[PDB]
């Protein structure tokens, strides 16, 4: 979107801001490297030194460059120095390779470790944290941090040192060779950084004010799209567009000012370099002539200084990423360093046996709703060898009971006394959980096999066997299956499993999906049984069973072992499950705390008294698409020629600088008549600078100008088309507001930052390409041919970075992903049993597949990166050798070679610099193809059409006649609504309507304003509605909806909505007649106050009276009311009813109403009611009563006089 882009642009703090931000909080730079062995702590030194060496390369190359040129011009050999490059290049390659390996063996390790540590903390959550940050969010966080640290810690941390070393070569070498020259050169760049700083603020100050005018448009759009119906009826299509257009302009002008300043500064940058070169050569020559020191030594200075100040452009970004990654990890660290509150030691002193588990006034609140206490006087005791039972709903608080028995929530005052001399906190957690069997509402298991799902609890038991006195992987095979076998016959799951083969050898689906729900419950129950359940707890277990499965489970559990000493619980909705019970506790808070209310059994309370249980058992018992765009563009003429000119200049004049540099180099080695040449060339360089500045500036500025004008003219057509569309269009599902605003706010901005930004680049690149390939071959065909062959085959067959990024992205997408996803669903079941079974299993399933792909990826990619760094050296050397080999045998001179070379090189480099500013085009070429039909679609109801009968307000009758209707919504053309409707309203005569609620009453008004065209036969004054030229038809009705809708504009306009030709005095008189101008007169900005969006700064009564006065202004002939006083407070409702009766006293308008206030209905001179006896539709029962037929026959009016 647009807002996100600008927020990203503005919320981009510098390195100084980050430095001051990290200064106070004191993040350790040792933070990412903490879990390292000392092995890696030494290994890291290798890549450190293997970096600094490779960055001490270029100073040598530069200190031999000038001597190559001197040795070449005046006829001598160059062979030794060539070797003194090539060997050096080789060592660079080696070092580069090595460094890669080191990173891709460090990072992964210190990555992987932290993963498990994070994961560990998730399995020591103290219950409440499962509610705080539940599940998937954490995965939406975790992986994010990985991509924020696996892309800011690798090679991009070390390269800077190389560059630093390179800096720390060049300048100081240039400093020892000479002093004054490089100072007089470098004096200028501070004046560049100054301009950059000064221009950034002038960008931002306009950028924000551009946003102050945007969001207003968004509000205008959405606020209008919700209020489509009132806008349609009241004819405010035009006034909105004025607001929209008046808002666009401020935005456009500000953003264009910003773009202008930006292009200006960029041009200045492309200008100053040339003045730098010129003054450099001039001053150097002058001090040579004053000397009587070589000239070649000058050449090696300049480039070096320049390239030095290139490195500062490219160092700084990488740093930020590292720092970014750094703070990211800090977050995760304080997540591992949390302090859960129910953490274990497996060391709490446990007892021999269980007796006297007592409770006293459980007082506990939810963590969020601290001001909502849950239980008040819950107290009881649970002695060994006793059964119990409970009944309730699924939100009363039994979840907290289960969490208390399980030690997940720790109540404040309620005690957990057990055995009368020990606390559950003194007692071990895991010994407590070892002897517990629970089966929740839904069964929850894992996806390996049935027997191993069962043996998980057994593993949890063997843990206690081996811990208090790595055997775990061995003893688990000691556990057998026959227990599961002879208990599987008891739960009657032998036929389903015997049917298909592979009884338990089969692997069951995700969360054991292949079983039925009841069968998964059978297996969960068998698990609970096999784990020595000292207590069995069901949590709405039978809430989703048919009768047979529940009864079989009941027979299974009622006579189950350990009945001498256990606490069996059976919770459910139906009560027959507790037809037998030794004790039943029931509670309620009948609103700040519950407590036990009743006790008893089934028979001794079903027919004993009229308590709660008795009441419950008694009651319940393509081409042209874009050619359109190109047409709209080339209609512009003044701003196409100028971009064309500046393109030609900036393209076909930069290569000239290459040969100009060459012609200076040659004459720099001829001591005679050297001054005149120096002048004659330096001046030309100045002129080139002057031209390039202007050309680039105007290029960028008019580019942005054109894009802006296109967007402005585009949104207008789209919005002005979509506004007038019909209503059934909006009735569709996929015709949503949000999608449409998204189109308007995204696709067009892509259309600017897409097409027009990409076409210019292609034009400029192609121009430079053609001029160079036409220029070089004229001087030296052989060299240019071979060079083009080399770069072609290199970049299109040995494309190193492309293949590298392919490897990175195809690897970044990535079965531990299956297990890790499976875990966070069955969090409950791992808390039931098994914490470190998977802590170690995931490590294995990761490392088994890590290394084999790791070796191939690293051994392939490190060499690619190494060769990527050490190519241009070899190319330049090969070029010089081939050149001299031709020169000495005398086939081509030196100057043609020099010229062709420099042209080719500088143009290639600059085109590489320039291509990295493109934008997205495919998505923009696709969006247009998507939303083009909407800005052309035919509405089928257009007010703009003026072909029909004209009507004048002076001669309106107000008679209506209807015969029959069978209407069917488009949401469901399967069940009709209206059937055989017919009635009348003669003239200035009330007609009150009352029907069954939801009987389609408030759809009839849609038929009148043609919101839904059409079986059905209307007659207004004995002509059908469809030939009245509806432009006028919506200027004499008026509506008072169930809810009004106020717009962000002030009162004076909303009340003037529709009719601008409305003086303030009309507003005053119609307000006093509306009985409203008493609160408004007593406030500043009387007819000027700005309400909020949707009038959220207002009441209901004032809103309604305003909505009514907005209708009264037109003096509409046929008023249409519908239920305007539903649920208002006393005084406003009173004033409103007063105004209604005041209006209805005057029989000057044919009023229609829908109300249920019999005191006002009786005055109605007509009654017509709509019944819906059976679900077929609606039709009339009574007619022509008008209070003369009070209760004479069976109907609904008799009801609405006695019922109502
Ligand atoms: O063309 C220049 C360039 C320089 C140098 C350096 F001077 F460091 F050896 N190496 C470049 C490389 C290289 F592969 F690192 F050699 C590729 C492309 C451009 C390079 C860059 C790219 C934009 C124009 C000025 N800096």
Swiss-Prot record:
GO molecular function, one term: ABC-type transporter activity
Residue sites binding ATP 2 per the record: 514, 516, 518-519, 969, 972, 997-998, 1000-1003, 1042
Phenotype when changing residue 868 to C: Decreases ATPase activity
GO CC annotation, single: vacuolar membrane
Catalysed reactions listed for this entry: ATP + H2O + xenobioticSide 1 = ADP + phosphate + xenobioticSide 2
Span list, region R domain: 1-24
Keywords, alphabetical: ATP-binding, Hydrolase, Magnesium, Membrane, Metal-binding, Nucleotide-binding, Translocase, Transmembrane, Transmembrane helix, Transport, Vacuole
ABC transporter domain segment(s): 357-590, 960-1202
Residue intervals annotated with topology Cytoplasmic: 1-47, 99-155, 200-262, 317-639, 702-758, 801-866, 913-1204
Residues the record lists as binding Mg(2+) 1: 441
Residue ranges, Vacuolar side: 69-77, 177-178, 284-295, 661-680, 888-891
Keyword Signal assigned: no
Binding-site list for Mg(2+) 2: 1002, 1042
UniProt cross-references to InterPro entries, sorted A to Z: AAA+_ATPase, ABC1_TM_dom, ABC1_TM_sf, ABC_transporter-like_ATP-bd, ABC_transporter-like_CS, P-loop_NTPase, Type_1_exporter
Transmembrane segments: 48-68, 78-98, 156-176, 179-199, 263-283, 296-316, 640-660, 681-701, 759-779, 780-800, 867-887, 892-912
The keyword Hydrolase is assigned to this record: yes
Annotated ATP 1 binding sites: 366, 368-369, 394, 396-400, 441, 1098-1099, 1101-1102
Further comment found in the protein's record: Can transport human ABCB1 substrates rhodamine B and vinblastine. Does not transport amantadine.
Annotated function: Energy-dependent efflux pump responsible for decreased drug accumulation in multidrug-resistant cells. Transports lumefantrine, mefloquine, chloroquine, quinine, quinidine, amodiaquine, piperaquine, dihydroartemisinin and quinacrine.
PANTHER family given in the database record: ATP-DEPENDENT PERMEASE MDL1, MITOCHONDRIAL, ATP-DEPENDENT TRANSLOCASE ABCB1-LIKE
Protein name per Swiss-Prot or TrEMBL: Multidrug resistance protein 1
């Amino acid at each position: 979107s647009i807002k996100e882009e600008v927020e990203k642009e503005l919320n981009k703090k510098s390195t100084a801001e980050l430095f001051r931000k990290i200064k106070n909080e004191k993040i350790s730079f040792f933070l990412p490297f903490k879990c390292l062995p000392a092995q890696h702590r030494k290994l890291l030194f290798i890549s450190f030194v293997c970096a600094v060496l490779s960055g001490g390369t270029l100073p040598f190359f530069i200190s031999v460059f000038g001597v190559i040129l001197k040795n070449m011009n005046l006829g001598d050999d160059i062979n030794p120095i060539i070797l003194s490059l090539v060997s050096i290049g080789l060592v660079q390659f080696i070092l580069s390779m090595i460094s890669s390996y080191c990173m891709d063996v460090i990072t992964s390790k210190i990555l992987k470790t932290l993963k498990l540590e994070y994961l560990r903390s998730v399995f020591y959550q103290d219950g409440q944290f499962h509610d705080n940050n539940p599940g998937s969010k954490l995965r939406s966080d975790l992986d994010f941090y990985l991509e924020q640290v696996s892309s800011g810690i690798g090679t991009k941390f070390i390269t800077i040192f190389t560059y630093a070393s390179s800096f720390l070569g060049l300048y100081i070498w240039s400093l020892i060779k000479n002093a004054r020259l490089t100072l007089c050169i470098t004096c200028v760049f501070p004046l560049i950084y100054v301009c950059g700083v000064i221009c950034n603020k002038k960008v931002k100050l306009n950028k924000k004010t551009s946003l102050l005018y945007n969001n207003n448009t968004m509000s205008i759009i959405e606020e209008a799209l919700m209020g489509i119906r009132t806008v349609a009826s009241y004819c405010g299509e035009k006034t909105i567009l004025n607001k929209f257009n008046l808002s666009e302009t401020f935005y456009s002008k500000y953003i264009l000012k910003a773009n202008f300043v930006e292009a200006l500064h960029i041009g200045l940058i492309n200008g100053l370099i040339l003045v730098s070169y010129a003054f450099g050569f001039w001053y150097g020559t002058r001090i040579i002539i004053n000397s009587a020191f070589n000239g070649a030594s000058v050449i090696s200075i300049l480039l070096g200084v320049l390239i030095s100040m290139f490195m500062l452009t490219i160092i700084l970004p990488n740093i930020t990423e590292y720092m970014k990654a750094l703070e990211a990890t800090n977050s995760l660290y304080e997540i591992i360093n949390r302090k859960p509150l129910v953490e274990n030691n497996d060391d709490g002193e446990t007892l021999p046996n269980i007796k006297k588990i007592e409770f006293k006034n459980v007082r506990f609140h939810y963590d969020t709703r601290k001001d909502v206490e849950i239980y008040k006087d819950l107290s009881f005791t649970l002695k060994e060898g006793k059964t119990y039972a409970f009944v309730g709903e699924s939100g009363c608080g039994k979840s907290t009971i289960l969490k208390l028995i399980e030690r997940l929530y720790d109540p404040t005052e309620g005690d957990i006394i057990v055995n009368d001399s020990h606390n559950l906190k003194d007692i071990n957690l895991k010994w407590w959980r070892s002897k517990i069997g629970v089966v929740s509402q839904d069964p929850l298991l894992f996806s390996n096999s049935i027997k191993n799902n069962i043996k998980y609890s057994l593993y949890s038991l063997k843990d206690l066997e081996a811990m208090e006195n790595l055997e775990m992987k061995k003893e688990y095979q000691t556990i057998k299956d026959s227990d599961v076998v002879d208990v599987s016959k008891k739960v009657l799951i032998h036929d389903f499993v015997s049917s298909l083969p592979d009884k338990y050898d089969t692997l069951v689906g995700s969360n054991a999906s292949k079983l039925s729900g009841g069968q998964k419950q059978r297996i969960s129950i068998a698990r609970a049984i096999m784990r020595n359940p000292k207590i069995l707890i069901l949590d709405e277990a039978t809430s989703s069973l048919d009768n047979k499965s529940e009864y079989l489970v009941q027979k299974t559990i009622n006579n189950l072992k350990g009945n001498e000493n256990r606490i069996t619980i059976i919770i459910a909705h139906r009560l027959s499950t507790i037809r037998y019970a030794n004790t039943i506790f029931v509670l309620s808070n009948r609103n700040e705390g519950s407590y036990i209310i009743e006790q008893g059994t089934h028979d001794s309370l079903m027919k004993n008294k009229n308590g709660i249980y008795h009441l419950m058992i008694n009651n319940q018992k393509a081409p042209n698409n874009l050619r359109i765009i190109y047409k709209e563009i080339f209609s512009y003429k003044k701003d196409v020629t100028i971009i064309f000119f500046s393109i030609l200049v900036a393209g076909g004049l930069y290569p000239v600088f290459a040969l100009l540099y060459a012609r200076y180099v040659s004459t720099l080695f001829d001591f005679a008549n050297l001054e005149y040449n120096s002048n004659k060339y330096s001046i030309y360089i100045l002129l080139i600078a002057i031209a390039m500045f202007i050309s680039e500036t105007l290029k960028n500025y008019y580019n942005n100008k054109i894009g802006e004008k296109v967007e402005k003219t585009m949104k207008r057509r789209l919005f002005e088309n979509i506004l007038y569309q019909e209503m059934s269009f909006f009735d569709q599902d996929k015709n949503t507001p949000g999608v449409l605003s998204a189109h308007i706010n995204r696709d067009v901005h892509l259309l600017k930052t897409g097409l027009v930004n990409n076409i210019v680049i292609f034009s400029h690149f192609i121009m430079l390409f053609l001029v160079s390939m036409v220029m070089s071959f004229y001087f030296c065909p052989i060299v240019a041919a071979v060079l083009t062959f080399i770069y072609f085959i290199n970049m299109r067959v040995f494309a190193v970075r492309a293949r590298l990024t392919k490897s990175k992205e195809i690897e970044k997408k990535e079965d531990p992903s299956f297990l890790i996803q499976e875990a966070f669903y069955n969090m409950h079941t791992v808390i039931n049993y098994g914490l470190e079974d998977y802590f170690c299993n995931l490590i294995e399933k990761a490392i088994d597949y890590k290394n084999k792909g790791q070796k191939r990826r690293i051994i392939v990619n490190a060499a690619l990166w190494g060769f990527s760094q050490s190519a241009q050296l070899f190319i330049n050397s090969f070029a010089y050798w081939f050149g001299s080999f031709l020169i000495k045998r005398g086939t081509i001179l030196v100057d043609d070679f020099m010229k062709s070379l420099f042209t080719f090189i500088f143009t290639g480099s600059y085109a590489g610099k320039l291509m990295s500013l493109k934008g997205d085009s495919e998505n923009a070429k696709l969006s247009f193809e998507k939303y083009y039909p909407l800005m052309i679609r035919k509405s089928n109801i257009d007010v703009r059409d003026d072909g029909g009968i004209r009507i004048n307000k002076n001669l309106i009758k107000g008679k209506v006649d209807i015969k029959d209707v069978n209407f069917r919504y488009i949401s469901r053309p399967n069940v009709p609504i209206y059937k055989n409707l017919s009635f009348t309203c003669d003239s200035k005569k009330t007609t009150a309507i009352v029907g069954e609620t939801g009987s389609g009453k408030s759809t009839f008004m849609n038929l009148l304003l043609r919101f839904y065209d059409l079986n059905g036969e209307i007659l207004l004054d004995d002509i059908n509605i469809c030939d009245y030229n509806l432009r006028d038809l919506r200027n004499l009705f008026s509506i008072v909806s169930q809810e009004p809708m106020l717009f962000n504009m002030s009162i004076y306009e909303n009340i003037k909505f529709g009719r601008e030709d409305a003086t303030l005095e009309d507003v005053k008189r119609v307000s006093k007649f509306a009985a409203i101008d008493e609160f408004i007169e007593s406030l500043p900005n009387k007819y000027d106050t700005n309400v909020g969006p949707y009038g959220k700064s207002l009441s209901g009564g004032q809103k309604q009276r305003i909505a009514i006065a907005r209708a009264l202004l037109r003096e509409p002939k046929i008023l249409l009311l519908d239920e305007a006083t539903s649920s208002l407070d006393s005084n406003s409702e009173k004033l409103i009813e007063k105004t209604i009766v005041d209006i209805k006293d005057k029989a000057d308008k044919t009023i229609i109403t829908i109300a249920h206030r019999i005191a006002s209905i009786k005055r109605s001179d007509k009654i017509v009611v709509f019944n819906n006896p059976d679900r077929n539709g609606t039709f009339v029962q009574s007619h022509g009563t008008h209070d003369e037929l009070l209760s004479a026959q069976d109907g609904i009016y008799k009801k609405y006089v006695k019922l109502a």
